[PDB]
Amino acid sequence: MEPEEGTPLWRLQKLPAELGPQLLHKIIDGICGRAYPVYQDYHTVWESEEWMHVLEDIAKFFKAIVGKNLPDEEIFQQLNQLNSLHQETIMKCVKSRKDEIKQALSREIVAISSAQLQDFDWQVKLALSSDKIAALRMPLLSLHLDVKENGEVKPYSIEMSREELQNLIQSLEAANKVVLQLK
Amino acid sequence: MGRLHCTEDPVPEAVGGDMQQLNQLGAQQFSALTEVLFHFLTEPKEVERFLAQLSEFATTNQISLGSLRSIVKSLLLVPNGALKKSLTAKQVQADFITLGLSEEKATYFSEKWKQNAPTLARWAIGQTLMINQLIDMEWKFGVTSGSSELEKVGSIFLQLKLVVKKGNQTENVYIELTLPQFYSFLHEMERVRTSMECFC
Amino acid sequence: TNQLVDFQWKLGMAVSSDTCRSLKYPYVAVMLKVADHSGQVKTKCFEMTIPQFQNFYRQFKEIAAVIETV
Amino acid sequence: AGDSAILLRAIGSQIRDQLALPWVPPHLRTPKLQHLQGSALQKPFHASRLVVPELSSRGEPREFQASPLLLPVPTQVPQPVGRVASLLEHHALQLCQQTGTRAQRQRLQKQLTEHLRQSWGLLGSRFTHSEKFTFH
Amino acid sequence: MAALTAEHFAALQSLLKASSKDVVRQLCQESFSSSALGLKKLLDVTCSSLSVTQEEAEELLQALHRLTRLVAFRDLSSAEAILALFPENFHQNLKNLLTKIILEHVSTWRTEAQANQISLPRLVDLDWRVDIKTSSDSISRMAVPTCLLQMKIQEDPSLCGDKPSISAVTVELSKETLDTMLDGLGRIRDQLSAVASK
Amino acid sequence: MAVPAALILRESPSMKKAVSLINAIDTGRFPRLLTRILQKLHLKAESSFSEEEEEKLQAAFSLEKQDLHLVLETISFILEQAVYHNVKPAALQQQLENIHLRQDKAEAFVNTWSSMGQETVEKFRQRILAPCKLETVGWQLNLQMAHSAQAKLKSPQAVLQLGVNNEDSKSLEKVLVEFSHKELFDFYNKLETIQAQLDSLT
């Protein structure tokens, strides 16, 4: 004996259908960058080695139907095998979360590159003296970059005077002019 | 038996003009150019020597080196397809005749191609991909007489050094085998030999 | 040897750079995800020009032809 | 200048207050002295993308937002430092967006398309010695 | 291996404090096998079982480690040789019990020590495939046989650090290269069919 | 001990060309050529001649670079086989004539091998097949006088530096080790065990 196979949501047929909306929205939160659901809530529904495939099979479905901009009728036709409440649940999740999923995909298209800026921070400080000169009073900016490369996040730091920061901003303003012709 | 065929229909029109430039050559000039081109192809990394030969050839005839480069490029198009396909000399000859090289000159080029082709075929097979090619092996056969844990031991061992080409660079791989492992290793690699000597 | 886990692509235009106001050239960018020995998975990305894609795509059509008549 | 004089006077009185306290061994520092003497851990600025309710929401998107399935916005991040960094960068982007030609834009997109068509339209040792001498 | 001392033998007297002969037997067996880090873990195990002080337990594990490996290093083949190591003042029933335990394990100890010698990285597994190459980007057709050799190799984990202790390398051989190394390895086989070298 | 009577030096097309060239090679220069190669032979990272010296050899012989290179490789292979077998002089003479080498070249080999070969065989015997060697030993002796946690010390300290050659990388790594007096005597006792193990072999 073995379960059915077909639309990869065949593993959802094991759920009690009243749990449907909770799990599917929480998987979408994980797609978009929040926490995924925890197995402890569903350990009676799937095996621990099976649960890992439930998450993957659901995430692929939502990504695929949004990326292809499918019509609602073509989505219904893919859901024909599911329980009617699971069919209705999934259609509602699409309508409510379509625009949020689409933004997650756009973020993932930027990752088709060798390195990405993950986060930044900055500090302004005043240097009051040094071993070279006692009446130094030089403003400096420290810019901290977190760059994701080869699946690891690397910290960089860059220090700028008033004039270096002016050249930086003047260059990024030229880039922004081009961005705003496209955006 | 044999059948005449061209390499392919997409060919630059300039190639036909270059064959007309070979028609302008004297037979002694054409034959010298044939041998110069094959002298490169028999040593195909000696590009500097070929360029020196082209300079001498250009200076001897007093022909523009740019026009000579055209002739060289136009000629090379036929062997590249021919060697990849493994075309016959007569097929190469008919193609050169279609390009407009005179049938005698195309005959000499196809015959010198014919002689060189077994040499060039062996070269081409060498270029084909290999994954982590073994290029050298060194070995040491010995006995462990004593250790820090036991005064007396008496354990036979084999050490191998494998030198492995990994694209642009080489690596050394060090492996120690016990006595039972050595015979198991040698027994397997003799099976390899046997199946490399028979198929189907 | 290595095995492909996934293949992804994007098509884009390079529009402008600080040295060249009108770049305006298209590219194809490919991401390969490969599994190593013991299943360690890693990604590699590279750009192609549009002529390079046409060649890359053309050669895979040769592989598919020989692999049937092998 | 009066404003810079006030700054330097504030700077100097901070250095006094720090010089006035001795160095304490790291295993004895209470949390105040951990901050002054550098044995506390700072946490990096890391921002996560939030979901916020939209008042103009109607239909099925509103039915989601009106329900426990959309968590209260700051509680969507487990850690308070990431929670702070997330709200800060979310609000920063809103200011950039709201603070920012159709013929010029259509013209540019048509210029980009012609370049794509024009680009495609080009389709239109003793071991080696022993081998060399006796096994090659 | 350095000789034992009266301080070590006094630690062995802690075995009189120990709860059972098999507890002694356990401590003997584990102290031979245990690393220094294992000895920290085993020290906690010893304190928990014996409830003696950590000093007594640590010195006892040190004394057994030193005693057992001294016998294994020398390979003392009889009780009489082992008994000579013990001082005359030692508790004779415990001294006789230790001799019995040492006799049983000593055969196993030399076998276990002989496996864990230092070496270059060891061969763990060997696999091979023979293919015939049929075509390439540059030759339309071919018929060249090739061997891919796959080896799985392990290094002492103390030398690896961050890296995994075991790795795999593929190596490709033509028959020309294969024949060359079959000669090289055959030499060693001929000189052992009669049990000593040529 | 015994050495096989079969062909130590073996026929091949490249060998047959080289044999004709070596018979042609100037007998007045050939002994000097041989001794340089034999002295170098144990070195894998080093050529027997520079390209400038190979140009001088080309100008003397009137060989091409590839022909001279083949000859140098052929001579190396002949001498490599002589080391591996540890061939006796008279046996070497016969093998050279068996590849149809001319008498003066064969005699020139036998003379050059006779003195220099035995040193070369010993130099090969000391070769190591390992990724790392111990290369250098060095030490410094110090007297501790004080530190931030104790005054009035008088403790001898030794620092040992071991220079380890990593021939995979052609880089030497310097390892520094501290010893107290008790620690250095413990180390000495282990070296004394290694020496007794070594002395058991003789």
Assign C15 to helix, strand or coil. coil
CA distance A87 to A12: 11
Which burial class, exposed, middle or buried, applies to E14 when counting CB atoms under 10 A from its CB (0-12, 13-18, 19+)? buried
CB E153 within 8 A of CB E167: yes
3-state secondary structure of D18: helix
- The H-or-E segment that residue F166 falls in is strand F155-166
Structure token pair of residue A76: 């219904």
Q: What residue ranges in chain B does DSSP mark as E strands?
A: 133-144, 155-166, 169-178
Distance CA B61, CA A135 (A): 78
Q: Could you tell me which residues are beta bridge partners of residue E149?
A: E128, E171
Largest Cα separation within chain A, whole Å, is 85
Burial of C8 (0-12, 13-18, 19+ CB in 10 A): middle
Write out the two tokens for D28.
Answer: 């004895």
With b meaning 16 or more CB within 10 Å and e meaning fewer, what string describes D17-52?
eeeeeeeeeeeebeeebeeebeeeeeeebbbbbbbe
> What is the largest distance, in Å, between two alpha-carbon atoms of chain E?
88
CA distance D38 to chain C (A): 38
Distance CA A76, CA A88 (A): 9
Contact between residue A112 and residue C10 where contact means Cβ atoms under 8 Å apart: yes
- From the list B34, B27, B24, B125, the residue with the least C-alpha distance to B78 is B34
Residue B18 CB neighbours (<10 A): 23
Tell me how far the alpha carbon of residue D5 is from its chain's centroid.
35
Q: Which residues are registered as beta bridge partners of E170?
A: E150
* Integer Cα distance of C49 and A100 in angstroms: 32
Counting as contact any 3 or more CB pairs under 8 A, the partners of B are D, E, F
CA C8 to chain centre: 8
- Whole-number Å distance between alpha carbons of E21 and F132: 47
Amino acid of residue F6 = A
What are the Cα distances from residue F5, in Å, to C52, E144, F98?
62, 36, 12
Burial class (CB in 10 A: 0-12, 13-18, 19+), E155: middle
Interface of B with E in 114-143 (CB under 8 A): 124-125, 127-134, 137, 139, 141
Count other Cβ atoms within 10 Å, centred on residue F181.
11
The residue among D105, A44, F192 whose CA lies nearest residue C15 is D105
- The tokens describing B131, both together, are 């994954």
Q: Which of A52, A48, A57 is nearest to A13 (CA)?
A: A57
The single-letter code of the amino acid at D104 is Q
Contact B161 F197 (CB under 8 A): no
The neighbour count for residue A123, using CB atoms within 10 Å, is 11
Reported structure resolution in angstroms: 2.9
What's the CA gap between A131 and A112, in Å, rounded?
Answer: 47
DSSP element (H, E) containing F45: none
Residues after which a C–N gap over 2.5 Å breaks chain A: none
Closest C-alpha to A23, from A34, A32, A8, A12: A12
Tally of CA atoms within 13 A in the half-sphere of B135 that contains its CB = 14
* DSSP 8-state secondary structure symbol assigned to residue D132: I
The pair of structure tokens assigned to B123 is: 């070269």
Work out whether the CA dihedral F129, F130, F134, F135 comes out positive or negative: positive
Method: cryo-EM
The phi-psi region of residue A150 (left if phi > 0; otherwise alpha if psi is between -120 and 50; otherwise beta) is: left
A151 sits in the region (left: phi over 0; alpha: psi -120 to 50; else beta) called: left
* 8 Å CB contact of D63 and A92: yes
SS3 category, F127: coil
Locate F188 and state its tokens. 């000495």
Helix F65-85 vs helix F51-61: crossing angle, to nearest 10 = 100
Report the candidate in A5, F188, E126 with the shortest Cα–Cα distance to residue B186. E126
Give the DSSP letter of residue D42.
P
Cα dihedral sign, C17-C20-C21-C24: negative
E3 and E74 in contact (C-beta within 8 Å)?
no
Beta bridge partners of C32: C7, C44
Interface touch D133/F77, C-beta < 8 Å: yes
* Residue C44 backbone dihedrals phi, psi, to 5 degrees: -135, 135
Q: Token pair for residue A35?
A: 């926490």
Dist CA C25 CA D118 (whole Å): 10
CB E126 within 8 Å of CB E94: no
Interface test with E, best of C61, C66, C67, C68 (most E CBs within 10 A): C66
C25 burial type by CB count under 10 A (0-12 exposed, 13-18 middle, 19+ buried): middle
- Residue E177 contacts residue E147 (beta carbons within 8 Å): no
The strand pairing partners of C47, in sequence order, are C29
Using DSSP's 3-state secondary structure scheme, residue B55 falls into helix
**Edge-to-edge strand ranges of the sheet holding F132-144:** F132-144, F155-166, F171-179
For chain B, give the residues followed by a break (C–N over 2.5 Å): none
* Nearest CA distance, A3 vs chain D (angstrom): 30
Residue D57 backbone dihedrals phi, psi, to 5 degrees = -65, 140
Q: Count, in order, helices (H) and strands (E) of chain C.
A: 1, 3
Distance CA F37, CA F18 (A): 16
Binding-face residues of E in 152-191 toward B, CB within 8 A: 153, 169-173, 175, 177-182, 184-186, 188-189
What is the SS3 assignment for E140? Answer: coil
Structure tokens at F108: 């020139």
* Chain centre to alpha carbon of residue F107: 25
Rg of chain C on CA atoms, in Å:
16
Supply angle C-alpha B21, B22, B25, rounded to 5: 95
What does the CA dihedral D79, D83, D85, D89 come to, rounded to 10 degrees? 150
What single-letter DSSP state applies at residue F202?
Answer: -
Looking up tokens 């046997």 gives B194
Smallest Cα–Cα separation from E175: which of F15, B160, B190, D129? B190
Q: Does F84 contact D134 at a Cβ distance shorter than 8 Å?
A: no
- Dist. CA F110–CA B49, nearest whole Å: 40
